[PDB]
Amino acid sequence: VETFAFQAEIAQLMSLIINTFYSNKEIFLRELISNSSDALDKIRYESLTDPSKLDSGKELHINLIPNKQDRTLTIVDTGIGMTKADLINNLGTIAKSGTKAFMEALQAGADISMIGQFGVGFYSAYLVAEKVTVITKHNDDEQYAWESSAGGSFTVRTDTGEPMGRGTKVILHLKEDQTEYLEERRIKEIVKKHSQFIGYPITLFVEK
């Protein structure tokens, strides 16, 4: 397990998200579904010139899986997946500029719900999750697990759990007072409100 420090600007963003009073927390789900859609768009596009890129799975879709016993909401997609370099350095490089723009927008009157316009919507997960685990698999690369409970650090390891084929699984370990996001009616409501036109099937699993 390797441990890394967030860039200071990203740590500052995470602290703002965790500490600012803001009731409209449900927007986290739109942001993660949007990221999944983006990753699905990319594998679809690349498959048009190299069909073998779908050897790791032809189905392009998103599953939402609540588990009340583990207190997790999991978002699974079969998108392009992230590489080790994506997780450790490269996406963070991009996030630095988006965070700067977002911060300046907030100071100037914008609200947290506009976060995705700056390319850093992932971090809205910390509105509802005490810990986020991201399991991801890109073609021709290994399966990795990224994880953070904020506080300025994250970890990355090669994942020895169930093989995914290709794509990304975001496991939200929900805060104790945010368990509404495990309820079927609540998730359905949020998907219909904010993610109704996503161009891939979204299957909301039910609990056993």
Ligand SMILES: COc1ccc(-c2c(-c3cc(Br)c(O)cc3O)noc2NC(C)=O)cc1
């Ligand atoms: C908004 O920035 C993004 C958006 C998506 C990704 C991504 C992902 C990805 C990342 C997150 Br977090 C997520 O919730 C879902 C995803 O499928 N998998 O490959 C990618 N790789 C690419 C290039 O999309 C990475 C950065």
